[PDB]
Design a protein around this nucleic acid. Structure first.
Ligand SMILES: [Zn+2]
Ligand SMILES: [Zn+2]
Ligand SMILES: [Zn+2]
Ligand SMILES: [Zn+2]
Lengths: 72, 71
DNA sequence: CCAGGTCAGAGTGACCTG
DNA sequence: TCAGGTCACTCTGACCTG
C-alpha cells in the first residue's frame, strides 16, 4: 500500500519526481503553471491530509516543493 | 459598513450580525447542511477576504462567537 | 432592509489514453 | 512506468425575489 508523501493518502505512483496521489499530482501542475496568490491563514505549518488538503494551497504547494517535485 | 467576520464590506445585518454576502450565505449552509469542517491550523486562523475560503471551521467559529443564529 | 433562492465560476480529483 | 486531458462534482457569493 503506497502512500502520498504530501497528504498521506493512497498514492498511485511517482508523479513529477515524488510518490503522490492523483489530487496532489493535478494540484502541483495547476499551482506551478498558474498565476496563483496563496496565503496561509495559519503559521505556514498546516496539517495536510486527505480531509484538510483543500484548506491551505499555500502549505500544500510548499510541501510539494520541499519534497522535490518538478515539472522537468 | 464592515463585516465582523472577515472585515470585507458588509451589506447589512444578517442573522443578528453585520456581515457581507459571503459570510451570510456561508453561515446558513454551515449550520443546516452536513459539513466535515476541520482546521488544519490551530483553530485561530486569520479570517479575512483573501483567506476566508481557507478555513471554514474557523470561519464558522467566528460567526458563532459573534452571535450569529438562524433561530 | 432582511431572509430565502439561485446559478455560473473556480478549484478539485477520479478516470482514461498511449 | 507516468504525463496530459477531461468533466462532473463541491463550495462560493454576487445577484435576485418575496
Ligand atoms: Zn496527496
Ligand atoms: Zn497553511
Ligand atoms: Zn464576511
Ligand atoms: Zn482554522
Amino acid at each position: 500500500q503506497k502512500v502520498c508523501l504530501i497528504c498521506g493518502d493512497e498514492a498511485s505512483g511517482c508523479h513529477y519526481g515524488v510518490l503522490t496521489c492523483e489530487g496532489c499530482k493535478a494540484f502541483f501542475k495547476r499551482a506551478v503553471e498558474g498565476q496563483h496568490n496563496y496565503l496561509c491563514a495559519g503559521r505556514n505549518d498546516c496539517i495536510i491530509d486527505k480531509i484538510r488538503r483543500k484548506n491551505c494551497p499555500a502549505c500544500r504547494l510548499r510541501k510539494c516543493l520541499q519534497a522535490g517535485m518538478t515539472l522537468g
